[model samples]
Target chain A: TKQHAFTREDLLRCSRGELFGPGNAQLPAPNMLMIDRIVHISDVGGKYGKGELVAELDINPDLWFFACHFEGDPVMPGCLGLDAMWQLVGFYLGWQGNPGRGRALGSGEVKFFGQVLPTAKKVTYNIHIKRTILVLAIADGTVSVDGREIYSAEGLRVGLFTSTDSF
Target chain B: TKQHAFTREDLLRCSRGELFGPGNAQLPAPNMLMIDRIVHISDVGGKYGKGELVAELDINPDLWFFACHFEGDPVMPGCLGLDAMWQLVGFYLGWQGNPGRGRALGSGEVKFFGQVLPTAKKVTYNIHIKRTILVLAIADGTVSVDGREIYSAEGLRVGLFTSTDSF
Candidate 1:
């Protein structure tokens, strides 16, 4: 039960290029290049011992998932929601301290409260780092449309640093 | 712990062309179009009240996830692992008698045991259904490379039929 402070402008200021910070090549591209921008990254020294991030993207009507998900009725697949959080985890780990890279080890609870639509002008993602110890990190995240929750998840990720043993 | 039987021939017979059965066009494309073939599907009647399925795909070096995941190191994103299982869940539910389509409601435990290399000749996914309600289904599944466990998940999905409220 920790508090957070973030705004859309905060997210827009960082943008994707600066989401993980400068001179950091450890972060990967947003899943499927679907992310339009990364708007926020919280300080790691907060009560959560990590921080938070805000990412934004548009649900394009023409995306492949929409077409095949249900034929006539297209909705954003829930797995893609998880995929978005997974990418955010990578960004968080890299932003914290990993010089190599990060990847999801597993996932905790994930819930889809509502169907995501292609008409969604902007989908916002919020990832809050719960903890990071050694090579492992945990996070809680959510996907929102405007201000409504669409999906949420708790994720676990591992850092892969050294070439010989870690990554 | 449900036990069931299936075969490669069985899966080939169904194929993507007919996996959802006749006249059912609600299923979506296999996660990311990464599945080359669905090699197996267990019977719907098992100890867990459901069956299982096996899916296969090659980790093509040129796939998008590899390039963005890591510049010099290309490993399959774990979310894609979940995506694979999610697709299998859809196939399972539709096969089980859903008049239309199936989509995930949420997920249970999902673990990534090892890194999947882009050079892998092929990856196999196995999904076992644990339970099913009128409109909801629960399942457990795993991913492997030549017998080594790489990833696994327990998923929950809902059938989207009737056109009025189910979806």
Candidate 2:
């Protein structure tokens, strides 16, 4: 079994390492690991084709939530947020498609229902994976904040090798 | 003088707060701030017309580096990334020909280049700005990590906005 042997101390330490270098005040670190709180973790535990992973997180208002609007209401980097979805899909499927391996297969019809607020807390992630063939696949996932769907993706992706070969 | 008082400390504090909680025990308080060191901020600098803004970022181990043998040998999410270029343009010129004030309008061709590696440090960036009235606006930029070009884009985005007057 993969050990998630992470304690509060471990997290704190890891976060410290991420935000602050190893006691070195010169080299700053990436803060992505700091504010993100993983409230839950469920493996590909449910079923093969359609599995689910839900996480409750708090978006630290003071820090993470910059005034994207008050300063002319600048929009979020649409690509960054959207590309993040593809990364999640790759992670869930145990597929490593980095750099250029992953492409956003065109969506049929997407509706932008709402904007994501920095103060938004906790998102329930529900993903449906359908493996049409061994290598060809399609999937959809949603990120909901407080029972409201903030982001969702419905698209298709394929593995180079046939599905019968490997994941 | 104006507020040229910003220092590395300010950036670190801001970035840390954004990523981690306000007073989480995990992230240390005082740390250096090299936040934008490896990051490629593809802002649509310089002046342009009233249309769309587009930029093409080159690939490098630092930017689009990937590692994998098969699994569809994934390609980058094309449209999503292109949208990033659009965001840059939007910031500078505002969306063009937008019925809803200044929405983006237009598209172009994108092509893949050499293979990207996780260790690749840079990529070329190309961009162009296509305007509503300007008719033609394009900017070309590329990224070359360790002296090798990886990904390239040659395109234009037309802005979307309703004419305040008449056609």
Candidate 3:
């Protein structure tokens, strides 16, 4: 299998400059905010994988909705949702190294269906990153609460430099 | 010369039937959501003809974080942001006809360098695209708030798609 579970210590070791370090072994940096947290092992999509980790955001509804179109209809920015996914990727990777960021590879395809309200709670997202993929790319199959298809993207995430000084 | 502004309705017009239509486009089907509103704009970086658009998300925070980060810390997914930029490109063209969605005929890159929060009230995405270059893609950029860089990516973004579609 291309996946392995790691504790906070294991992840700490992996990102410290070995494991996936230079010479083909390198890993993302550590999370500065929560140092003791481990990279919770979740199945990338396998039966043994950790159930998808859900993240919650608290948006102010007063600023999001308007009286036009449908009454009490609030629209959350799609970019913010997309941005949230990227931040999680960074958090999982620990946002370490010089350029503490990852690139989103273009997707082969994606589909967005359903409306997200500003007041929705524990909005859930099911994302599966296909690892069998080659090239500097990753694809996530996403589904929202109520089993609605949000969108899936064949992301070719790339990072140009890893040195702590290049960024 | 290749920069300006448009109404949210104009952006929506360019998005419908064109950027998110039936056909081969650089952007895929299933939009994350429509551009219900335009929050803000900026010249952003002084170079790269960089510009950004701030908008609201349609989904709530819980799902926003989940869809973004399932295996790790969430970073805004690139496809969603890239798709938004593609729409911007379409708008720049007045939706007349651009291989706006799925066409990757040229080589381009996009980068994220900031963590976007749901409580942040708004999302700002920086962009850079033009036809003068041989490889057409969104140059390196970031998603930011106040003045901090959150998420970033760099890669070829343009593709070759049929011109029959509006995107």
Candidate 4:
């Protein structure tokens, strides 16, 4: 069993520019901003000294990937689904005010169980920072649709920091 | 140790419209097509029966993801690197003439090891198909830069089949 820190409405509000006052930092461009909103933040003295973060995205039927990922059958590509999670994780590293720019070094135990079709309206990502050492950080994360678990990754990332470069 | 069925030249030829007659299929738009060329491939009754694939891409400094993935410092997002592998896998299914449109359903034991900086000239993807039943397929894959292993994934994907959809 898992616990959550935010609600659907709370996340939606953030996406609509409510919570963090346009917390939209420079993301990976609109085409690559697969994950929609930074709905929650629980870092800086939470669980891991550098805590947890939450994000949400609406699976738009016309999402860029839909046009050609599978031609006629438009299931969001699995990696893009993973993209949604990675973007949120990257954002967290940036939001935490880390000294250096963060780059993904590696990941562990990633899995996908179901199809994210246009029929599904929303997806939620819950991420927890497990540890941080100087410029290296590790975290675990999960993705769910309509309360149903669809994807998860353990020790999802290993981020390496670079000099004086902020996200 | 595993063996490969295709060569680097074979892939370059495909990119230049030799094999598969232009081997061009609709990919997941620009941001997600992390790799630039389908450098190698293996399939049913080929070198591995359920073969393997390889792709190569130059991390262009001006790639779309660079614009926003991070404002000041640009590092290729990990998911996008993973996206390179998945796209090659999906291309395998379509190239092999699978009965159904290919849909990525699941993955296993995926890992990353190093950062793919825009400064690096290129990265290579090596993938092996472990099994395929009906419309489902499984694989293992790795990414390398400058001859050094940087990322790897096991049970990389389980692809599902749909109808006649290309790429």
How close is chain A of candidate 2 to the true chain A, as a TM-score? 0.51
Models sorted by lDDT, best on top: 1, 4, 3, 2
Measured against the native two-chain assembly using Cα atoms, what DockQ does each of the candidate structures obtain, in the order listed?
A: 0.49, 0.07, 0.07, 0.35
Q: List runs of model 3 lying over 4 Å from the truth.
A: A1-167, B1-4, B18-68, B71-75, B93-111, B133-140, B153-156, B163-167
Candidate 1, position A40, lDDT: 64
Off by over 4 Å in 2: A1-49, A63-80, A95-111, A132-137, A156-167, B1-83, B92-167
Residue-level lDDT tens digits of model 2 in A38-131: 2333344423535444433344454332343212222222333333343344333332221112223333222233444555554445545644
lDDT of 3 by residue, A20-47 (tens): 4442222334211112232332535422
Docking class for model 4 is: acceptable
Candidate with best TM-score? 1
lDDT of 4 by residue, B74-127 (tens): 666667677677667766765665444445555676676566667677888887
Which window of ten consecutive residues has the lowest lDDT sum in model 4 chain A?
A17-26
- The digit string of per-residue lDDT tens for model 3 on B87-151 reads 34333332223433332221233454434444344455454433322223343334555455554
Q: Which candidate is the best by DockQ?
A: 1
lDDT of 1 at B50: 66
Worst 10 residues of 1 chain B by lDDT: B1-10
Candidate 2 chain B minimal-lDDT segment of 10 residues? B25-34
Q: Per-residue error at B129 for model 2, in Å?
A: 8.9
For each candidate in turn, the interface RMSD (Å) is 3.9, 13.1, 11.5, 5.0
The CAPRI-style docking tier of model 2 reads: incorrect
Candidate 4 lDDT over A36-130, as tens digits, reads 66666776543456687777778778777665554444667667667666656655655555444445555677777766777779888777888
